[PDB]
Design an enzyme around this catalytic site. Structure first.
Site, PDB file in Angstrom:
ATOM      1  N   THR A 299      -6.037   6.576   8.091  1.00  0.00           N
ATOM      2  CA  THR A 299      -6.608   6.856   6.779  1.00  0.00           C
ATOM      3  C   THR A 299      -6.662   5.633   5.875  1.00  0.00           C
ATOM      4  O   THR A 299      -7.040   5.774   4.709  1.00  0.00           O
ATOM      5  CB  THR A 299      -5.828   7.954   6.051  1.00  0.00           C
ATOM      6  OG1 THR A 299      -4.526   7.453   5.718  1.00  0.00           O
ATOM      7  CG2 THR A 299      -5.719   9.224   6.913  1.00  0.00           C
TER       8      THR A 299
ATOM      9  N   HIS B 135       3.572  10.889   6.755  1.00  0.00           N
ATOM     10  CA  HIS B 135       2.930  10.566   8.024  1.00  0.00           C
ATOM     11  C   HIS B 135       3.963   9.936   8.935  1.00  0.00           C
ATOM     12  O   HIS B 135       4.428   8.819   8.668  1.00  0.00           O
ATOM     13  CB  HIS B 135       1.759   9.616   7.799  1.00  0.00           C
ATOM     14  CG  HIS B 135       0.592  10.271   7.133  1.00  0.00           C
ATOM     15  ND1 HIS B 135      -0.413   9.563   6.504  1.00  0.00           N
ATOM     16  CD2 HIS B 135       0.276  11.582   6.995  1.00  0.00           C
ATOM     17  CE1 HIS B 135      -1.310  10.409   6.031  1.00  0.00           C
ATOM     18  NE2 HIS B 135      -0.912  11.640   6.309  1.00  0.00           N
TER      19      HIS B 135
ATOM     20  N   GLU C 291      -3.361  13.473   1.318  1.00  0.00           N
ATOM     21  CA  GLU C 291      -4.636  13.050   1.882  1.00  0.00           C
ATOM     22  C   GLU C 291      -5.378  14.243   2.469  1.00  0.00           C
ATOM     23  O   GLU C 291      -6.510  14.533   2.073  1.00  0.00           O
ATOM     24  CB  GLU C 291      -4.385  11.963   2.926  1.00  0.00           C
ATOM     25  CG  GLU C 291      -3.656  10.767   2.322  1.00  0.00           C
ATOM     26  CD  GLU C 291      -3.941   9.487   3.061  1.00  0.00           C
ATOM     27  OE1 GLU C 291      -3.548   9.383   4.248  1.00  0.00           O
ATOM     28  OE2 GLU C 291      -4.577   8.593   2.475  1.00  0.00           O
TER      29      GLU C 291
ATOM     30  N   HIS D 110       0.813  -1.215   0.000  1.00  0.00           N
ATOM     31  CA  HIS D 110       0.000   0.000   0.000  1.00  0.00           C
ATOM     32  C   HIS D 110       0.842   1.259   0.000  1.00  0.00           C
ATOM     33  O   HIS D 110       0.446   2.261  -0.595  1.00  0.00           O
ATOM     34  CB  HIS D 110      -0.937   0.035   1.220  1.00  0.00           C
ATOM     35  CG  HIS D 110      -1.859  -1.143   1.308  1.00  0.00           C
ATOM     36  ND1 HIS D 110      -2.940  -1.307   0.470  1.00  0.00           N
ATOM     37  CD2 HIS D 110      -1.862  -2.210   2.141  1.00  0.00           C
ATOM     38  CE1 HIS D 110      -3.574  -2.424   0.785  1.00  0.00           C
ATOM     39  NE2 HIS D 110      -2.936  -2.994   1.792  1.00  0.00           N
TER      40      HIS D 110
ATOM     41  N   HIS E 184       1.992   9.093   1.301  1.00  0.00           N
ATOM     42  CA  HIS E 184       0.959   8.897   0.293  1.00  0.00           C
ATOM     43  C   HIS E 184       1.284   9.838  -0.855  1.00  0.00           C
ATOM     44  O   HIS E 184       1.727  10.961  -0.612  1.00  0.00           O
ATOM     45  CB  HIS E 184      -0.436   9.207   0.857  1.00  0.00           C
ATOM     46  CG  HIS E 184      -0.759   8.436   2.106  1.00  0.00           C
ATOM     47  ND1 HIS E 184      -1.544   7.302   2.097  1.00  0.00           N
ATOM     48  CD2 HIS E 184      -0.366   8.615   3.389  1.00  0.00           C
ATOM     49  CE1 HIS E 184      -1.639   6.827   3.329  1.00  0.00           C
ATOM     50  NE2 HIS E 184      -0.921   7.595   4.128  1.00  0.00           N
TER      51      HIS E 184
ATOM     52  N   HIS F  48       5.675   6.840   6.696  1.00  0.00           N
ATOM     53  CA  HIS F  48       5.350   6.447   5.335  1.00  0.00           C
ATOM     54  C   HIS F  48       4.819   7.672   4.608  1.00  0.00           C
ATOM     55  O   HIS F  48       4.609   8.729   5.206  1.00  0.00           O
ATOM     56  CB  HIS F  48       4.307   5.332   5.306  1.00  0.00           C
ATOM     57  CG  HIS F  48       3.012   5.735   5.932  1.00  0.00           C
ATOM     58  ND1 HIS F  48       2.762   5.579   7.281  1.00  0.00           N
ATOM     59  CD2 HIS F  48       1.917   6.336   5.410  1.00  0.00           C
ATOM     60  CE1 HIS F  48       1.561   6.053   7.558  1.00  0.00           C
ATOM     61  NE2 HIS F  48       1.026   6.520   6.440  1.00  0.00           N
TER      62      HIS F  48
HETATM   63  C1  LIG Z   1       0.043   0.757  10.477  1.00  0.00           C
HETATM   64  C2  LIG Z   1       0.320  -0.492  11.060  1.00  0.00           C
HETATM   65  C3  LIG Z   1       1.719  -1.049  11.235  1.00  0.00           C
HETATM   66  O1  LIG Z   1       2.700  -0.360  11.143  1.00  0.00           O
HETATM   67  C4  LIG Z   1      -0.715  -1.341  11.463  1.00  0.00           C
HETATM   68  C5  LIG Z   1      -2.050  -0.972  11.368  1.00  0.00           C
HETATM   69  C6  LIG Z   1      -2.331   0.267  10.846  1.00  0.00           C
HETATM   70  C7  LIG Z   1      -1.306   1.082  10.439  1.00  0.00           C
HETATM   71  C8  LIG Z   1      -1.641   2.425   9.912  1.00  0.00           C
HETATM   72  C9  LIG Z   1      -0.791   3.506  10.545  1.00  0.00           C
HETATM   73  C10 LIG Z   1      -0.961   4.717  10.163  1.00  0.00           C
HETATM   74  C11 LIG Z   1      -2.018   4.956   9.116  1.00  0.00           C
HETATM   75  S1  LIG Z   1      -2.165   6.676   8.681  1.00  0.00           S
HETATM   76  N1  LIG Z   1      -2.335   6.687   7.010  1.00  0.00           N
HETATM   77  O2  LIG Z   1      -0.970   7.333   9.191  1.00  0.00           O
HETATM   78  O3  LIG Z   1      -3.368   7.232   9.292  1.00  0.00           O
HETATM   79  C12 LIG Z   1      -2.761   4.030   8.558  1.00  0.00           C
HETATM   80  C13 LIG Z   1      -2.556   2.606   8.998  1.00  0.00           C
HETATM   81 ZN   LIG Z   2      -0.627   7.552   6.184  1.00  0.00          ZN
END
Ligand SMILES: *c1c(C=O)cccc1-c1ccc(S(N)(=O)=O)cc1
Ligand SMILES: [Zn+2]
Ligand SMILES: NS(=O)(=O)c1ccc(-c2cccc(C=O)c2)cc1
Length: 257
Positions: free
Chosen positions: A195, A116, A103, A61, A93, A91
Site C-alpha cells: 500500500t 500490518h 487503509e 512513513h 497506519h 507496522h
Molecule cells: C517494506 C520494506 C522493508 O521492510 C521494503 C519495501 C516495502 C515494504 C512495504 C511492506 C509492506 C507494505 S504494506 N503497507 O504492508 O502493504 C508496504 C511497503
Molecule cells: Zn502497511
C-alpha cells in the site's frame, strides 16, 4: 520523495510508480455483503511462539518492528496460502482523528488504525526476491478501534518517545506479537499490493474480521511521532494511510459465514 502530504501523497504516486493505477492495488473497501463465503478456505495457522523481535525503526512513513527472518521462527501458513511465509516486520497506519486511519475499510467504515504483519514466501529465499513475485508476500491486516487499552500493544507505545523522528531506531528484543491479535482468526482474503510505493502487486491480503481495541491514549501516542528527521520542522506523523482503491476484476473471499 513520496509521502502522505498534499504535494507528495497518494494522488501523486502514479507519476513515479505507475503501477499505482494497476489491476490489483491495495487497500480496498471490503463490501461484506459482496464477499463470498468459501467453505474450502482453511483456518489460518499463525505460529509466533518462536518469534524473535530485534528493533523498532521510525522510517519516516511509519514505524517498523523488525524480526529475525533468517529461520522459520514466526510463520504464517494455511488459510488461502500455499507454503510458508516468514514474519519480517509489522507496522501500523493511523489517523489524525479516531474516525480515520485504516487503509482497508469495511462497508466504507474507517477504523482508527490498521496493523500490518508482513510475511514473505520462503520459497523465494529473501524478501527482496519475494516482492517481485505475485505470491511473494502475505500481509495479515488487523483493524484498531478506540476503546479499551490493548495490553499487548503497550510495550510498543512505551518506546515511541525514543524513535520520535525519521531514522531513529531502538532495541526492541523479546516482544511477543501474539499480544496484538484478536480472539478470532476469521478473515477476508483477496490478491493485492503493497500500500506504499513501490506498490508492487505481490501481496495476498488476509484481513481479520475482528478488530482489536486500543485506548485513546495508545493511539494518541502514535500521533506524537514525526515524519521529519531531527532538527527539521516538526511534521506530526498522522494520516499515513492510502485510501481504498478500485477493486477492478477481483473477488474478496470470506472464511466465515
Ligand atoms: C517494506 C520494506 C522493508 O521492510 C521494503 C519495501 C516495502 C515494504 C512495504 C511492506 C509492506 C507494505 S504494506 N503497507 O504492508 O502493504 C508496504 C511497503
Ligand atoms: Zn502497511
Ligand atoms: N514519488 S511521487 O509521489 O510521485 C513525488 C516525488 C517527489 C515530489 C516532490 C519533489 C520535489 C518537491 C516537492 C514539493 O512539493 C515534491 C512529489 C511527488
Amino acid at each position: 520523495h513520496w509521502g502522505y502530504g498534499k504535494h507528495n501523497g497518494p494522488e501523486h504516486w502514479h507519476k513515479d510508480f505507475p503501477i499505482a493505477k494497476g489491476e490489483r492495488q491495495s487497500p480496498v473497501d471490503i463490501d461484506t455483503h459482496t464477499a463470498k463465503y468459501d467453505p474450502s478456505l482453511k483456518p489460518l495457522s499463525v505460529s509466533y511462539d518462536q518469534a524473535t523481535s530485534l528493533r523498532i525503526l521510525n522510517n519516516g512513513h511509519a514505524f517498523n518492528v523488525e524480526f529475525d527472518d533468517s529461520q522459520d521462527k514466526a510463520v504464517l501458513k494455511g488459510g488461502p496460502l500455499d507454503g510458508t511465509y516468514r514474519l519480517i516486520q509489522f507496522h501500523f497506519h493511523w489517523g489524525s482523528l479516531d474516525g480515520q486511519g485504516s487503509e482497508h475499510t469495511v462497508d466504507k467504515k474507517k477504523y482508527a488504525a490498521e496493523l500490518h504483519l508482513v510475511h514473505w514466501n520462503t520459497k523465494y529465499g529473501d524478501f527482496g526476491k519475494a516482492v517481485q513475485q505475485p505470491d511473494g508476500l502475505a500481509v495479515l491486516g488487523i483493524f484498531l478501534k478506540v476503546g479499551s487499552a490493548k495490553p499487548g500493544l503497550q510495550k510498543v507505545v512505551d518506546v515511541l518517545d525514543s524513535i520520535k523522528t525519521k531514522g531513529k531506531s531502538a532495541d526492541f528484543t523479546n516482544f511477543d506479537p501474539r499480544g496484538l491479535l484478536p480472539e478470532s482468526l476469521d478473515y477476508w482474503t483477496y490478491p493485492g499490493s503493497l500500500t506504499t510505493p513501490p506498490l508492487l502487486e505481490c501481496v495476498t491480503w488476509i484481513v481479520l474480521k475482528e478488530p482489536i481495541s486500543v485506548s485513546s491514549e495508545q493511539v494518541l501516542k502514535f500521533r506524537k511521532l514525526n515524519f521529519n528527521g531531527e532538527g527539521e520542522p516538526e511534521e506530526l506523523m498522522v494520516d499515513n494511510w492510502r485510501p481504498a482503491q478500485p477493486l477492478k476484476n477481483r473477488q474478496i473471499k470470506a472464511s466465515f459465514k
